[PDB]
Cholesterol oxidase
Amino acid sequence: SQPNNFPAEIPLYKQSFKNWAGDIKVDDVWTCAPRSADEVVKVANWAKDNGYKVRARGMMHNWSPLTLAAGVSCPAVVLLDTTRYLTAMSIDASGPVAKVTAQAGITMEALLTGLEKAGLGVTAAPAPGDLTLGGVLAINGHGTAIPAKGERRLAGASYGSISNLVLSLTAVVYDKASGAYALRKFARNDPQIAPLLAHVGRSLIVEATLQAAPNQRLRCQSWFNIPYGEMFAAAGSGGRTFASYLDSAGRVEAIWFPFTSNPWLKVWTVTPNKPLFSRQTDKPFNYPFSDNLPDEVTDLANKILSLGDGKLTPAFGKAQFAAASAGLVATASWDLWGWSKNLLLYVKPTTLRVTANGYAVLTRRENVQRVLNEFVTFYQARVQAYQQQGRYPMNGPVEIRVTGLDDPSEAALSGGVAPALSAIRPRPDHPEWNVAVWLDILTLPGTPYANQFYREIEQWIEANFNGSYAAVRPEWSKGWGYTDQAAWADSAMLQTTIPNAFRAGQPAAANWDAAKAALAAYDPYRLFSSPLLDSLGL
Ligand SMILES: *Cc1cc2c(cc1C)nc1c(=O)[nH]c(=O)nc-1n2C[C@H](O)[C@H](O)[C@H](O)COP(=O)(O)OP(=O)(O)OC[C@H]1O[C@@H](n2cnc3c(N)ncnc32)[C@H](O)[C@@H]1O
Ligand SMILES: OC[C@H]1O[C@@](CO)(O[C@H]2O[C@H](CO)[C@@H](O)[C@H](O)[C@H]2O)[C@@H](O)[C@@H]1O
């Protein structure tokens, strides 16, 4: 069924949709590539009269079904490929803090490269460069960074998600006076912007202005000689704990392969001059042996998933650790140095395709080690319980990152508001919770028992990280709300637990219900949604 009366000057065509993990694949989805923000608004106003949803089509990296659902032949949805034309950017350095305005289809690699050429950069960002700015803002995309002990924040920088850098944005919003959708610009100190800073797919952003700080030189050191029992030891310290590196450098990520002893630890340190033996790099993606999988790894993945040989999982984790550790040694990449974007961007899409769950655990900075040690202790014991039964649900690594919260005091204006729906929006009732520990576990899509295992982990995370100790919000882009059959399917999590995570500690005027109401007012025809967003009641 071809859509009727579609704007004549905007070419409409069928194009398949396939997310990065490969588990959402829809054929022949009606797609167009708007040349301008005005063309986006034309498509929205046609869609409301014709019963089609409207979603931005970025790089299709998201795991959760926020664009459209899997298994739906040729949906009543029109996708707007923002990557072709909505990519322009400009920089205004006429104030005490530089500002970059960019159309929402630009990639993070292009954005950060444009900033570098102007002497500017950001504290943290997602590891891939092949993501649109609009996709990253929609789900509070983030990297890893908190301040090292003694570090002062640079004006125009933040330790939160990319959503926290927004100073202004232009969204497609219903204008009640004219009865039509139109472009509307919002300032970061306008409370009405709050649901749009990270709208989870409930809006369409055509352009945003972000703060940018003077660019930093970073060193990025990798270590594979620290046993997980030491790295993730109980608070009570001693040794090379993950928290000791947060204090010395502030920017830390651990990737811990299954059934292996030593995680791949990456530590980024702000380092003005290149250390004597560090290798300078002037490009991003410096771990080619991680981006280009060796045959040993791809062969084991295929045996495990396609041939059902799950007992090869421990060997598979060892192969993955070998690829990372011996690969870093072969490419002389364990101690790198250069402008920030070259070290912040480090994952290409040719890496191992995996699904992942994800959670942000808000807590006091001093509690990070406890959080990590608690999660690692529970995970190891569950993995063992499953291995006892001959099951290997998790065949990818555990990944740990830590960031600040989306605290508007870090935005370079007075009265900035927190994103209403960011997973790391602050908790007014707990001013002492000032970090978020991000926890994820990766596994090949479709691995037997994965959902059942992810459900056990999710139930324990919600039970454990509670009270005045910590709180939990799901990482929107990843898996959550698990039943034994699927992710994003548990009724209690969708109807009660997640919405409550956005009411706890918040004023009624700025909580889950207020955000939902504002997004509905901005989109009365409900153009901007997918079955998951409907099931969440957002
Ligand atoms: C695949 C992947 C993703 C990823 C990652 C590593 C890989 C291999 N590492 C990440 C990380 O280090 N930190 C982080 O926070 N996220 C990481 N991700 C996830 C990624 O950031 C998100 O999935 C992001 O949304 C992907 O961007 P992309 O451009 O690919 O977006 P999409 O999948 O097509 O769309 C996702 C949702 O965003 C909406 N969207 C996209 N553009 C807009 C605009 N302009 N306006 C409003 N909404 C927009 C889509 O409609 C959809 O709802
Ligand atoms: O971050 C410094 C780095 O940026 C460059 C451009 O790539 O210079 C930019 O920033 C300088 C310092 O503010 C400015 O002098 C210059 O005008 C601006 O382009 C590099 O030359 C510099 O090493």
Observations:
- The first helix runs from residue 37 to 50.
